[PDB]
């Protein structure tokens, strides 16, 4: 997250860190005690058996007893097309069930087919690049929905008046709009915080019935 701010500790208990060799590489969202959702490109050509799903984290540079670590049991995608950047969404089943508490909670999803209009105010977040290196503390950022320079197959956002936006390592992280998870960070154009192109998110509302068919 470029030009964002440190989140309050455990403000977004549904926020997840996906790690490889102990290092954060993508975000995800807890959508049931035994399922997280992230971006399909986060597991494309990865050895899923080594992916550690970390729940209840805040500062990735500190030892945190609030954390709950799971492994990935199964992968569920729905027409992910890397060539055309479509349906960048994956549901990862966990090898167990999370203990729901103050620091680990399930996210709420929108109704199937709910489209957001221009100007809707959202909150983006993640442990990706700051512009400075990877963030230690979870970062959040106020963003606004735009339908220009964006496809019907994405939810796009922009920061009005400043050089800020999502960056590398924020992929898979949620976009929260009116309390619901409406986006999964997918890609940026013209580099991070360009002020030319909006950041692109997988449109979660287009997949709700399918997510629900899996997580029940």
């Amino acid at each position, epitope marked *: 997250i470029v030009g964002g701010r440190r989140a309050r500790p455990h403000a977004w208990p549904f926020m997840v860190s996906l790690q490889l060799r102990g290092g954060h590489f*993508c975000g995800a969202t807890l959508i049931a005690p035994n399922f997280v959702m992230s971006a399909a490109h986060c597991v494309a050509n990865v050895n899923v058996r080594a992916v550690r799903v970390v729940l209840g984290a805040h500062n990735l540079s500190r030892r945190e007893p609030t954390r709950q670590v799971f492994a990935v049991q199964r992968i569920f995608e729905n027409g992910y097309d890397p*060539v055309n950047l479509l349906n960048d969404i994956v549901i990862l089943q966990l090898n167990g069930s999370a203990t729901i508490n103050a620091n680990v909670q399930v996210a709420q999803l929108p109704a199937q087919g709910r489209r957001l209009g221009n100007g809707v105010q959202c909150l983006a977040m993640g442990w990706g690049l700051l512009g400075r290196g990877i963030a230690s503390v979870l970062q959040e950022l106020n963003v606004t929905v735009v339908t220009s320079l964006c496809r019907r197959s994405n939810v796009c956002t922009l920061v009005r008046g400043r050089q800020a936006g999502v960056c590398f390592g924020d*992929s898979g992280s949620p976009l929260v709009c009116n309390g619901l998870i409406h986006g999964i960070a997918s890609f940026v154009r013209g580099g991070c915080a360009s002020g030319l192109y909006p950041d692109a998110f997988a449109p979660v509302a287009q997949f709700v019935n399918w997510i629900d068919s899996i997580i029940q």
Partner: nanobody
Amino acid sequence: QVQLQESGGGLVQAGGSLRLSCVVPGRTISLYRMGWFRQAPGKEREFVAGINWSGDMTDYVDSVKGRFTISRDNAKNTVYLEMNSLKPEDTAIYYCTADPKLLPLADSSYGYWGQGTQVTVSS
């Protein structure tokens, strides 16, 4: 849409030099990692070299360190592979690669691959 068109292959004499290029046609998606893999016939794909989106970090295979240099040009969304002191064991189809994941440059988890170009080092 997302494409990797390479150029700069061909023949060279042992000890020679060659420069390869790879463009990501259009400002369609900013890819964190860009690099080069290579494959000799009937052998496995080999990471050769890689680079950050910023250019602050690079990595190479130990068999090409000091001889090969990888550079990037975000303005022309290109990557280049300067190959010097070429050995016949460097003969392979060189593939330009790209990927969005924030992972080590040497991690063989690249999603985007070019068609490859033939580099043939003589003897």
